[PDB]
């Protein structure tokens, strides 16, 4: 197994899937690492295992049809990592917790959302609909966009949202286009 974790690329407490060899911190694992199970099988795993299982679900969806998915455990699943590879960037630090709003010029957004924020949403069932993640995570770099206007700071929004978009595309098999 890996001696770093995979999200965040640090030693310290780490899980070692069973079934690749990845390994995780507790928290950065999503869900948070298993009480007990043995073997245990990291969400990289998970996800493998239902493309595996239904080779169809890789050809391309309309992201419209995606968005209306309710939540059942696999679309549950597919939004675990997609918010975990997110964390899986180093800028992702810059929205993980809750952010505030303090600039000459600019005013704070109506509705601040941050990935912990999202974490929680997710591990409470909040979410009914694939729909209701995809506007929160995208909520959050629109927001930074909108707040950092001109401040070339506003090119983490950018580039932290094109991480996401990237693998929404990928794991929702979302059909290629020019
Ligand atoms: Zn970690
Ligand atoms: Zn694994
Ligand atoms: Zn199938």
């Given at each position: 197994?890996?001696?770093?974790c995979?999200?965040?690329?640090?030693?310290?407490?780490?899980?070692?899937?069973?079934?690749?060899?990845?390994?995780?911190?507790?928290?950065?694992?999503?869900?948070?690492?298993?009480?007990?199970?043995?073997?245990?099988?990291?969400?990289?795993?998970?996800?493998?295992?239902?493309?595996?299982?239904?080779?169809?679900?890789?050809?391309?969806?309309?992201?419209?049809?995606?968005?209306?998915?309710?939540?059942?455990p696999?679309?549950?699943?597919?939004?675990?990592?997609?918010?975990?590879?997110?964390?899986?960037?180093?800028?992702?630090?810059?929205?993980?917790?809750?952010?505030?709003?303090?600039?000459?010029?600019?005013?704070?957004?109506?509705?601040?959302?941050?990935?912990?924020?999202?974490?929680?949403?997710?591990?409470?069932?909040?979410?009914?609909?694939?729909?209701?993640?995809?506007?929160?995570?995208?909520?959050?770099?629109?927001?930074?966009?909108?707040?950092?206007?001109?401040?070339?700071?506003?090119?983490?929004?950018?580039?932290?949202?094109?991480?996401?978009?990237?693998?929404?595309?990928?794991?929702?098999?979302?059909?290629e286009?020019?």
């Amino acid at each position: 197994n890996s001696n770093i974790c995979e999200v965040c690329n640090k030693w310290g407490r780490l899980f070692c899937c069973d079934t690749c060899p990845r390994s995780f911190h507790e928290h950065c694992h999503i869900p948070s690492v298993e009480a007990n199970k043995n073997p245990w099988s990291c969400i990289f795993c998970r996800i493998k295992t239902i493309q595996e299982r239904c080779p169809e679900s890789q050809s391309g969806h309309q992201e419209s049809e995606v968005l209306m998915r309710q939540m059942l455990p696999e679309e549950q699943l597919k939004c675990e990592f997609l918010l975990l590879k997110v964390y899986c960037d180093s800028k992702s630090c810059f929205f993980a917790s809750e952010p505030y709003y303090n600039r000459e010029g600019s005013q704070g957004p109506q509705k601040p959302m941050w990935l912990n924020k999202v974490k929680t949403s997710l591990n409470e069932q909040m979410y009914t609909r694939v729909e209701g993640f995809v506007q929160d995570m995208r909520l959050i770099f629109h927001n930074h966009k909108e707040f950092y206007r001109e401040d070339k700071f506003t090119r983490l929004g950018i580039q932290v949202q094109d991480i996401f978009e990237k693998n929404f595309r990928n794991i929702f098999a979302i059909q290629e286009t020019s």
